[PDB]
Amino acid sequence: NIIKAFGILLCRLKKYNPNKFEFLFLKASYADKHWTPPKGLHENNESGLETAVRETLEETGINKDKYKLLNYQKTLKYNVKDKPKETTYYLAMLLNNEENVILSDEHTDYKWIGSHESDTYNLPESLADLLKEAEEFLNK
């Protein structure tokens, strides 16, 4: 009954400019002002992490050899048309900031955003808070 999705919260260390991380957000092709990390539904015989890795590869062209999976995950439960949804994000750090992002038909744009940009990108509280808490983890 719950729609379950899995994604990689992909981050990178922000380049110097005269909350030090950025997160890869993708703009949905089929929605209005809808930006999320790479994510999607299970396929067969997948752990949540396997699903997250595959969906990230499908949606960005970035495979798991390009990032370091970190010891942080969070499950967000929220409503979509009053239908319960749960999305689990696994934090990973992209080792080369400048990896070429290759979008699929699912998205029209991407942006590496800081946690402070959450309101600008109209993120729901669950996602905004995910970014802040991930940055807290990254600063341990």
Residue numbers in the entry: 4 to 21, 28 to 149
According to the publication:
Based on sequence analysis the P. falciparum Ap4AH (PfAp4AH, EC 3.6.1.17) was predicted to be an animal-archeal type which cleaves polyphosphate chain at the fourth phosphate from the tightly bound adenosine resulting in asymmetrical cleavage of Ap4A. PfAp4AH can asymmetrically hydrolase Ap4A and Ap5A molecules produced by PfKRS (and probably by other Pf aaRSs) to ATP + AMP and ATP + ADP, respectively. PfAp4AH folds into a conventional Nudix domain, with four β-strands (β1, β2, β4 and β5) sandwiched inside two anti-parallel helices (α1 and α3).
We also provide two crystal structures of PfAp4AH - in apo and sulphate-bound forms at atomic resolution. Of the three SO4 ions bound in PfAp4AH-SO4, one engages the P1 site (located between loops L2 and L5). Global structural differences between apo- and SO4- bound PfAp4AH were apparent upon superimposition. Three major variable regions arising from SO4 binding and different space group packing of PfAp4AH were identified in loop regions L2, L3 and L5 and analyzed further. In case of PfAp4AH-SO4, His51 forms a hydrogen bond with one of the water molecule in a nearby water network linked to Ser56. In particular, side chain flip in Tyr87 and His43 suggests substrate-induced conformational adjustment similar to the human counterpart.
